[PDB]
Amino acid sequence: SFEEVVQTLASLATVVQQQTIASESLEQRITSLENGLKPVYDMAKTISSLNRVCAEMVAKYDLLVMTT
């Protein structure tokens, strides 16, 4: 009776501790996505600069060559 209750309570406490440890590990692994996703933002940003540079090159092309 009382021994069974104590054993069940101890098992429940151990299971809760293990679940909290697993949740902490999950949170720690999840919080590593910022480092992996920052280059995505960097390459998204650099495309606009590359397009602007190419547009400037095209515009400066018509300055030199005579064309029609």
Partner 1 sequence: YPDARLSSPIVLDQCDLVTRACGLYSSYSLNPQLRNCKLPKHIYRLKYDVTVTKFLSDVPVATLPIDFIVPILLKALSGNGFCPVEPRCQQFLDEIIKYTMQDALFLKYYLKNVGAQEDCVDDHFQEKILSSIQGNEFLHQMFFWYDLAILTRRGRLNRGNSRSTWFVHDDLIDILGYGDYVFWKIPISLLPLNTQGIPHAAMDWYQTSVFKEAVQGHTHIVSVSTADVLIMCKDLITCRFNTTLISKIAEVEDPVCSDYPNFKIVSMLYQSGDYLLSILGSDGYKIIKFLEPLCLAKIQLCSKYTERKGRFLTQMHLAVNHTLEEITEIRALKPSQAHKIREFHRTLIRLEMTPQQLCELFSIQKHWGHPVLHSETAIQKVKKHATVLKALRPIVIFETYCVFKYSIAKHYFDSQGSWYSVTSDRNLTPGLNSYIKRNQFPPLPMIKELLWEFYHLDHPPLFSTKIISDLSIFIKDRATAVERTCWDAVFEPNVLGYNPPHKFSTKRVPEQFLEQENFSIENVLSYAQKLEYLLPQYRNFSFSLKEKELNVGRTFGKLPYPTRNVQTLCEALLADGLAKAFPSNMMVVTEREQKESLLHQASTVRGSSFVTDLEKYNLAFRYEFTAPFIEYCNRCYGVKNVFNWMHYTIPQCYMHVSDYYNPPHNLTLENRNNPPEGPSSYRGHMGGIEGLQQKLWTSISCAQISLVEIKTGFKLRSAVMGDNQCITVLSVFPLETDADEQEQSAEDNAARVAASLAKVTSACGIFLKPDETFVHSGFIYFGKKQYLNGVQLPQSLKTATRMAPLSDAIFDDLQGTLASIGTAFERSISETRHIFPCRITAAFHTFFSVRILQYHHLGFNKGFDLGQLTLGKPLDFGTISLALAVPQVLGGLSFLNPEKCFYRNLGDPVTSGLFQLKTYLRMIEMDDLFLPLIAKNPGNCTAIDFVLNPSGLNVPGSQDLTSFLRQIVRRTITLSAKNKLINTLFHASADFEDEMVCKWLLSSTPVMSRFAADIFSRTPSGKRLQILGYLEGTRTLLASKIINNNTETPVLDRLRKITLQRWSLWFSYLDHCDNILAEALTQITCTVDLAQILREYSWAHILEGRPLIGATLPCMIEQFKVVWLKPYEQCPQCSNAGKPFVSVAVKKHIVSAWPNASRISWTIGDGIPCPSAALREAIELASRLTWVTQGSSNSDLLIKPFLEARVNLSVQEILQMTSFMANRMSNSATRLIVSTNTLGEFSDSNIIFQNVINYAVALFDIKFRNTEATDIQYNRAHLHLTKCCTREVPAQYLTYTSTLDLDLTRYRENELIYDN
Question: Within 21-60, which residues bind partner 1 (CB under 8 A)?
Answer: 45-46, 48-53, 55-56, 58-60
62: alpha, beta or left, given left = phi > 0 and alpha = psi -120 to 50?
alpha
Of 42, 39, 62, 61, residue with least CA distance to 50: 42
Residue 63 sits in the site that holds partner 1 (CB under 8 A): yes
Which tokens hold the place of 29? 């692994």
Kindly list the residues in this chain that would bind a second copy in the complex (CB under 8 A): 1-2, 4-5, 7-9, 11-16, 18-23, 25-30, 32-34, 36-37, 39-44, 46-51, 53-58, 60-68
- Angle among Cα 6, 7, 9 to the nearest 5 degrees reads 65
Count of residues interacting with partner 1 (CB under 8 A) = 21
Please report how close the Cβ of residue 59 comes to a second copy at its closest, in angstroms.
10
